[PDB]
Amino acid sequence: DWRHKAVCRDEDPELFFPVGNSGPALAQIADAKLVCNRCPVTTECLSWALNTGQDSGVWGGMSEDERRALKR
Amino acid sequence: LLQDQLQSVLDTLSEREAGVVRLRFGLTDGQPRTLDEIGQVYGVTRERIRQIESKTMSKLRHPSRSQVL
Ligand code: SF4
Numbered sequence: 001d002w003r004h005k006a007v008c009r010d011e012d013p014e015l016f017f018p019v020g021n022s023g024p025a026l027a028q029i030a031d032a033k034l035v036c037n038r039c040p041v042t043t044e045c046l047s048w049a050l051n052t053g054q055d056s057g058v059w060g061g062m063s064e065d066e067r068r069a070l071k072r
Numbered sequence: 073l074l075q076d077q078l079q080s081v082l083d084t085l086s087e088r089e090a091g092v093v094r095l096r097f098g099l100t101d102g103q104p105r106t107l108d109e110i111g112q113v114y115g116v117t118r119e120r121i122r123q124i125e126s127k128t129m130s131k132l133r134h135p136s137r138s139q140v141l
Binding site for chain 2: 008
């Protein structure tokens, strides 16, 4: 299963849930996406997050706001 | 079991958020509470409870964490 190949299993999980103060956490979002960029299952991860409607967090190389923008 | 990752996720929330989730799922005394009861205890709206629950579930289900078979 694709979760077996998630490189974020070797990261701090909270890296993928940035919180900003008076604006976007641009740096932390980039830091999370950098891990996704060296992950072999970015597409499966993004597909699962989109198909099951994960609102919060960085999944599949996309921030929460980006996935929200895709959705209706 | 699931306790370890779930408690780990609860640790990342505020005390109020974690209380809301514990009451919603009945983690502490085995009695899930209604949205009304939770909004009365922690003074939060139904949409805010929805968002707390949604965020917690996304953290729990994120591939960074092993999932429970
Ligand atoms: S794409 Fe990103 S969030 Fe998804 S499994 Fe890989 S590192 Fe984790």
